[PDB]
Amino acid sequence: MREIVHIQAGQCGNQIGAKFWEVISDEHGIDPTGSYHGDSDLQLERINVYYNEATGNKYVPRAILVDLEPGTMDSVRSGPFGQIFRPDNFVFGQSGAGNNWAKGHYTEGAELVDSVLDVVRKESESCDCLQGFQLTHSLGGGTGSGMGTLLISKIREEYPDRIMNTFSVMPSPKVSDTVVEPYNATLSVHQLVENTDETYCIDNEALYDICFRTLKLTTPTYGDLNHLVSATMSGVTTCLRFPGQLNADLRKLAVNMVPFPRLHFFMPGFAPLTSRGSQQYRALTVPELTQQMFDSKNMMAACDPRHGRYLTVAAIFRGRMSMKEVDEQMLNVQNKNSSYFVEWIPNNVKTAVCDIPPRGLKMSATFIGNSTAIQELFKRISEQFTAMFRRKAFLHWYTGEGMDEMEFTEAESNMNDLVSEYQQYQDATADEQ
Amino acid sequence: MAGASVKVAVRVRPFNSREMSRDSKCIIQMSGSTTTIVNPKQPKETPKSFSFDYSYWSHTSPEDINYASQKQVYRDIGEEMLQHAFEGYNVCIFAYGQTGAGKSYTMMGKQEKDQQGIIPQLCEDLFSRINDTTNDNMSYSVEVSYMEIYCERVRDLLNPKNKGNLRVREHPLLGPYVEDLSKLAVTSYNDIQDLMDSGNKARTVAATNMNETSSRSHAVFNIIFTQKRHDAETNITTEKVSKISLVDLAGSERADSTGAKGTRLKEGANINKSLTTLGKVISALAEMDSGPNKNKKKKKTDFIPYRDSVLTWLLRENLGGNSRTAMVAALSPADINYDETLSTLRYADRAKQIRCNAVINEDPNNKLIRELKDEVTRLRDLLYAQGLG
Amino acid sequence: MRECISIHVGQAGVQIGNACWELYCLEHGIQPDGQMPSDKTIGGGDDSFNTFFSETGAGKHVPRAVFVDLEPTVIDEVRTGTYRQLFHPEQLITGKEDAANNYARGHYTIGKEIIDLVLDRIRKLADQCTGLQGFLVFHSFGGGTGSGFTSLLMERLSVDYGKKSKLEFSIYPAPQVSTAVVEPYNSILTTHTTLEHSDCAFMVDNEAIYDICRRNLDIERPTYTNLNRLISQIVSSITASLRFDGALNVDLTEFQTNLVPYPRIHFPLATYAPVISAEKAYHEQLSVAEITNACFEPANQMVKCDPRHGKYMACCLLYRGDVVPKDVNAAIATIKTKRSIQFVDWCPTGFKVGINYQPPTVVPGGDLAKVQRAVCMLSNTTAIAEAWARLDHKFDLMYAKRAFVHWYVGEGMEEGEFSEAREDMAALEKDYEEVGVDSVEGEGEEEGEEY
Ligand SMILES: CC(=O)O[C@H]1C(=O)[C@@]2(C)[C@H]([C@H](OC(=O)c3ccccc3)[C@]3(O)C[C@H](OC(=O)[C@H](O)[C@@H](NC(=O)c4ccccc4)c4ccccc4)C(C)=C1C3(C)C)[C@]1(OC(C)=O)CO[C@@H]1C[C@@H]2O
Numbered sequence A: 001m002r003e004i005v006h007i008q009a010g011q012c013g014n015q016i017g018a019k020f021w022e023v024i025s026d027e028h029g030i031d032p033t034g035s036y037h038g039d040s041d042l043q044l045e046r047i048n049v050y051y052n053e054a055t056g057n058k059y060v061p062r063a064i065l066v067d068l069e070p071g072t073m074d075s076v077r078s079g080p081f082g083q084i085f086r087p088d089n090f091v092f093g094q095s096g097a098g099n100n101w102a103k104g105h106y107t108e109g110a111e112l113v114d115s116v117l118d119v120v121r122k123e124s125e126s127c128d129c130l131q132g133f134q135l136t137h138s139l140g141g142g143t144g145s146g147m148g149t150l151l152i153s154k155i156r157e158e159y160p161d162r163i164m165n166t167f168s169v170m171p172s173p174k175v176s177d178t179v180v181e182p183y184n185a186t187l188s189v190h191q192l193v194e195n196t197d198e199t200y201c202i203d204n205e206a207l208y209d210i211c212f213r214t215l216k217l218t219t220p221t222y223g224d225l226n227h228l229v230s231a232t233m234s235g236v237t238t239c240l241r242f243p244g245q246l247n248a249d250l251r252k253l254a255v256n257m258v259p260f261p262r263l264h265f266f267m268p269g270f271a272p273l274t275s276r277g278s279q280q281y282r283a284l285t286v287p288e289l290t291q292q293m294f295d296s297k298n299m300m301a302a303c304d305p306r307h308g309r310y311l312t313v314a315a316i317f318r319g320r321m322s323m324k325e326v327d328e329q330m331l332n333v334q335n336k337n338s339s340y341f342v343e344w345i346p347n348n349v350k351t352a353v354c355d356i357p358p359r360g361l362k363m364s365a366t367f368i369g370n371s372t373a374i375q376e377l378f379k380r381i382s383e384q385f386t387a388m389f390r391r392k393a394f395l396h397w398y399t400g401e402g403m404d405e406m407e408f409t410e411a412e413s414n415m416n417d418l419v420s421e422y423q424q425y426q427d428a429t430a431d432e433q
Numbered sequence B: 001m002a003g004a005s006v007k008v009a010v011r012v013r014p015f016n017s018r019e020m021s022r023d024s025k026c027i028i029q030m031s032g033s034t035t036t037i038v039n040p041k042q043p044k045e046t047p048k049s050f051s052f053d054y055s056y057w058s059h060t061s062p063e064d065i066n067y068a069s070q071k072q073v074y075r076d077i078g079e080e081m082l083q084h085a086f087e088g089y090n091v092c093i094f095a096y097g098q099t100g101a102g103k104s105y106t107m108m109g110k111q112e113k114d115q116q117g118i119i120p121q122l123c124e125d126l127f128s129r130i131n132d133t134t135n136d137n138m139s140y141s142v143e144v145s146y147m148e149i150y151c152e153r154v155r156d157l158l159n160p161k162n163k164g165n166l167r168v169r170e171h172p173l174l175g176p177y178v179e180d181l182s183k184l185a186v187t188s189y190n191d192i193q194d195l196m197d198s199g200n201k202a203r204t205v206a207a208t209n210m211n212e213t214s215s216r217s218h219a220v221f222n223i224i225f226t227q228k229r230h231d232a233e234t235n236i237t238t239e240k241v242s243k244i245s246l247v248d249l250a251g252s253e254r255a256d257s258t259g260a261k262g263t264r265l266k267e268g269a270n271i272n273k274s275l276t277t278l279g280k281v282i283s284a285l286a287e288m289d290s291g292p293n294k295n296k297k298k299k300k301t302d303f304i305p306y307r308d309s310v311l312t313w314l315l316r317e318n319l320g321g322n323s324r325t326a327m328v329a330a331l332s333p334a335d336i337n338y339d340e341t342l343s344t345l346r347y348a349d350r351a352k353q354i355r356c357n358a359v360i361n362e363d364p365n366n367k368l369i370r371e372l373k374d375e376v377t378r379l380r381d382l383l384y385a386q387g388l389g
Numbered sequence C: 001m002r003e004c005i006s007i008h009v010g011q012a013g014v015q016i017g018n019a020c021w022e023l024y025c026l027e028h029g030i031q032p033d034g035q036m037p038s039d040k041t042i043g044g045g046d047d048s049f050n051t052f053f054s055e056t057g058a059g060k061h062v063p064r065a066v067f068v069d070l071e072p073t074v075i076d077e078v079r080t081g082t083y084r085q086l087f088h089p090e091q092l093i094t095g096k097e098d099a100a101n102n103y104a105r106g107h108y109t110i111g112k113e114i115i116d117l118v119l120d121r122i123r124k125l126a127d128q129c130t131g132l133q134g135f136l137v138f139h140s141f142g143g144g145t146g147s148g149f150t151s152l153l154m155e156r157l158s159v160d161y162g163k164k165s166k167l168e169f170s171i172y173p174a175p176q177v178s179t180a181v182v183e184p185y186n187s188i189l190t191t192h193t194t195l196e197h198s199d200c201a202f203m204v205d206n207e208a209i210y211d212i213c214r215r216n217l218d219i220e221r222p223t224y225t226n227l228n229r230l231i232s233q234i235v236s237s238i239t240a241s242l243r244f245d246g247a248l249n250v251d252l253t254e255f256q257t258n259l260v261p262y263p264r265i266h267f268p269l270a271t272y273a274p275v276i277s278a279e280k281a282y283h284e285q286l287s288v289a290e291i292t293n294a295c296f297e298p299a300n301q302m303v304k305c306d307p308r309h310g311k312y313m314a315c316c317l318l319y320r321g322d323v324v325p326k327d328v329n330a331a332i333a334t335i336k337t338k339r340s341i342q343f344v345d346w347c348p349t350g351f352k353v354g355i356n357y358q359p360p361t362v363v364p365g366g367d368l369a370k371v372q373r374a375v376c377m378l379s380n381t382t383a384i385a386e387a388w389a390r391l392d393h394k395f396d397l398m399y400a401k402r403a404f405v406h407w408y409v410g411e412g413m414e415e416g417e418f419s420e421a422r423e424d425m426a427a428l429e430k431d432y433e434e435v436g437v438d439s440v441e442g443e444g445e446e447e448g449e450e451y
């Protein structure tokens, strides 16, 4: 029995986690009270992946909620699915990080980390065979980034042989909400590059573009963006919970997608996505899903794949479909856009198929890419970072909490080395001397 | 900047007491810069042949012809590297070899002071030259540190405190380093060897299915050497600073040989990962050295994956830039360990891979028959061409 | 009693086993719950054939099958499926993670702690067996479990039983199509065990079967069920000769004796001639000559390799149904005159023939038509080298930069285990290139004494 422990820290992490628990709960037929009122029988077979079984035929998720302010806990509890969670997992303090990475990592989070790890240890010791962890957090924030990095460090220390996913919302050029984004982003990705097996790349601009262009929503809100991220989160681990013709575990994705240890930043996407009224105008088939998955405007990371090359890609289909169509479409995509795929991997497309699609759709698919274009998302941050570090714009707020100027330099150097490592494979030959 | 060539050396060993008592046969032959090995269970197929830079037959101790004497090895590696270090550049020796290979003898030698290893000869030569060249203007200082790497965690071997995990930092100018790593000065090579023994007492060692005491972790002995010059002025200047590194590499293990679970498999996996990354960086550095050294073109600076492991990260300055490298591999000479020996060669083949071709052992009967047939053909052609037959 | 144990490893093995056991139960009239109403209706007989089913006292029939996998999903689908009551409740499923497309994970780390239970169950099955003939191992190259665990199982079986035959059906990776990024590593690493321990290894390719199921059986969107059903038909054609009567009867040892000139070249291709849809079953005589000719067509091969680029070293034809020996002789004579089919000069006979009276069955809901005659051809030829050569190239393109290697070394392997295997692979290729060469001209150079 493969099982996953879910952690959510910070405002963004808690919001996405709440929406994710509403999306997964439906798929598995769970009442907001906790009782099961589904129809199919394939829904309870692997319920233990995400849920513990309570005494009175009630299911409680393994979610762990962390914060340094009680407001987001209060918002989550007073919600549609607030009562589903175990009240003992609401770990929180007061006097939040104040959008300061040092407070989240060195001053305030250092006191709450012991309690959070105690809860995590209690949850994990009850697992029959724990597979991995999930953590939802934002890089450009306060308590989220720092507490998430500190936690991931601790759990990687304690559980070195278990997978550690991470769904990170990193800052964006135009949609910037806080002034100290680059420091937090750099000091966070300095830690994520070391102590994480898989990191998924999300930002708000790509999701806004998806909402405005594909779904044609006039006034999108954060609920929609969380709804998307939740769709991707289930689609990643669909194969663990349901049968299929060709299964794909989390470890299979990690093995097939990561060529070298430090290149584990992935570009997620989902298909199909239409704008309500247009549904009747398009047929749903495997070629349509394949075309929409590889479209540049569908990506959730705001990095154009056409500016680089795909090191690897993975496609998890859900629905009753023919394997021949899937294989032929992946081969056609590889052979047609031959310039956007690395030459020294003979085949760089993982394919998985699950039999039971999402409730409401006859077919669906999730795309997980890994390409050199991700370097751009780092480069911009680094540029902004140096633009603030030459003058020490807001540095005293960080050095007043025990940090030192050397740490910023190490983080910047690690960013630059990661960027160069991704960039070495970008150029489309190496012949001249 | 400058490149850093790597000298690949392999040495066998004369049988041991257990080997001598048993009827085990040798299996390794070595000629020139080439070695060949015969599978004991497959005598019919072929011998595997590898070609290194440096090949050393220390099998027959009293041998007079083509015996790899200890002074020969020292002159062929350590003297040149010590001279390079004196010019003000970092240098390093990796020592690779599994249990029973005989790496310790090559690296340290016997305490009788009649057969020396590389370390004692290097230290003695360094201190002899220090005492010889200490004029009124020039001053010399030497410091020593000894650390251990275990499961991608650094520990102090000389400090007797609790074996906590030290934190690895990156000074912007002086590169990677380790915090709170005790640094001690030494006045005689006897102090260096005493510190080496004290640290070796503190190594992490565990019992395996193969040996009851096998090294489970890497170890680095850094000699930090400082030269201060007094020109004809009031300004004394630390003219150069160079490092001599002595790395002890644990071998590569198989899960089949050591089927223990828990900590043992974790240690084996970490050791294998570190060795693979080390081989990758050394091969890349050797290729980049070879390219510019002949072509003299600067192909950007390439990318050298230093960060993929702590071992290559802490040795970043020593490996890269203007530096010298040399790896020595010990190959047990029995047969019982044949596969092990082959694995050692396959790890010592890595980096600066060069062409060996097939070594064929001709039957003397067919050789003589072919030679006589050629002679008869030549003589008959000469006779019949002149009309004398 | 001619009795065989079928071993299914991995997802591909388990699904092919589902198809195969559906076919066997349909063939022998066994219901999904194990009962056979035919014996009760008639009174008795040998319909509880001991090749594949063991009969208990109450009249139930249990398959002589062993299923193994490191995931619980694929076998949990069988424990609660239509055939939930057919199998013994043992299914040897490790309630842990999977090999994760990693050979080392399936051979060294997690392959242990389940091999002992599998071997114990195999020994229990073998003890009940009298006159055991061999093993039928189903797996797939490119997977984690199907490569590493199959290698470990084959090694242990060769150590234990030794003399019994071990036939292997495997899914070689296709040239262009694939479903994983690290297929070449596992496929190359499996060469050691599939070479030394196995006796005869049959290779099938998904691209070839897709092509067949689009030209012959006119299906445009096939799934794995059709592939498994065709492979099941192939295996049933192979094994029919020790279940039913026939004019010429070929056991499992005759296969190895006739198709394996040397110990290291036991990689024959397989093909099924009358693959045709019900609509096109009409307008076609389907005589012995037609099916025999169709067996040799390059388009109908089950592996993407052209026989015209090599030489045939041995052939074995297994006929089913209303087939008479005279027509088989005429068809073989006709084939021998064609110039496009070249045989090695050192095998003048080059044909084994077997005829069985039992015609092939029709699975309900299937795709193949009901036919009166059928033939399965096995062909040991030199073209298979091509199918290997491509793979080797792919391996090099990933091993030059040591991509994906740290995953393999992190589970208990070392780097050298790659290179050694590659060297071994090269040797095998050279062996094929040595055997297909014509004998040197007047092989005793030239001769002729006085008189
Ligand atoms: C009834 C029907 O077929 O209509 C569709 C529909 O029109 C479309 C437009 C749906 C609709 O989605 C949206 O309008 C939407 C809005 C903001 C953000 C994201 C989506 C739909 O709401 C979404 C909804 O999807 C589901 O019900 C899935 O189970 C989905 N989960 C949820 O949406 C969900 C949310 C909260 C609580 C419970 C379930 C899912 C998808 C993948 C993986 C897991 C779950 C479906 C079928 C539709 C509507 C209702 C219009 C689309 O979404 C999905 C994920 O299917 C948007 O583009 C797709 C394509 C669909 O055709």
Ligand SMILES: Nc1nc2c(ncn2[C@@H]2O[C@H](COP(=O)(O)OP(=O)(O)OP(=O)(O)O)[C@@H](O)[C@H]2O)c(=O)[nH]1
Pocket (backbone or CB within 6 Å): A245, A246, C009, C010, C011, C012, C013, C015, C016, C070, C098, C099, C100, C101, C102, C139, C140, C141, C142, C143, C144, C145, C146, C171, C178, C179, C180, C206, C224, C225, C227, C228
């Ligand atoms: N013909 C056929 N091939 C299959 C089928 N199922 C899987 N395969 C093949 O199996 C390959 C994938 O590896 P698997 O054999 O499934 O690996 P596994 O047995 O699941 O073991 P793990 O890798 O540990 O999950 C694919 O490339 C397919 O070609 C099937 O039903 N029919």
Ligand SMILES: Nc1ncnc2c1ncn2[C@@H]1O[C@H](COP(=O)(O)OP(=O)(O)NP(=O)(O)O)[C@@H](O)[C@H]1O
Pocket (backbone or CB within 6 Å): B012, B013, B014, B058, B059, B061, B097, B098, B099, B100, B101, B102, B103, B104, B105, B106
């Ligand atoms: N060139 C040589 N000439 C003579 N004896 C040698 C030589 N090389 C090695 N030996 C013998 O090797 C012995 C030491 O072997 P040993 O200490 O067991 O190696 P080791 O412990 O396997 N190395 P390691 O475990 O990797 O630190 C010495 O006592 C010598 O007798």
Ligand SMILES: Nc1nc2c(ncn2[C@@H]2O[C@H](COP(=O)(O)OP(=O)(O)O)[C@@H](O)[C@H]2O)c(=O)[nH]1
Pocket (backbone or CB within 6 Å): A009, A010, A011, A012, A013, A015, A016, A099, A138, A140, A141, A142, A143, A144, A145, A169, A171, A176, A177, A178, A204, A222, A225, A226
């Ligand atoms: N998708 C999504 N992003 C959010 C939400 N709230 C905040 N963010 C993003 O997170 C950043 C602010 O970080 P914040 O949530 O305050 O971090 P925290 O203080 O540690 O909780 C902004 O750049 C937003 O883009 C939300 O509800 N949904």
Ligand SMILES: [Mg+2]
Pocket (backbone or CB within 6 Å): A247, C010, C011, C071, C098, C145
């Ligand atoms: Mg599987």
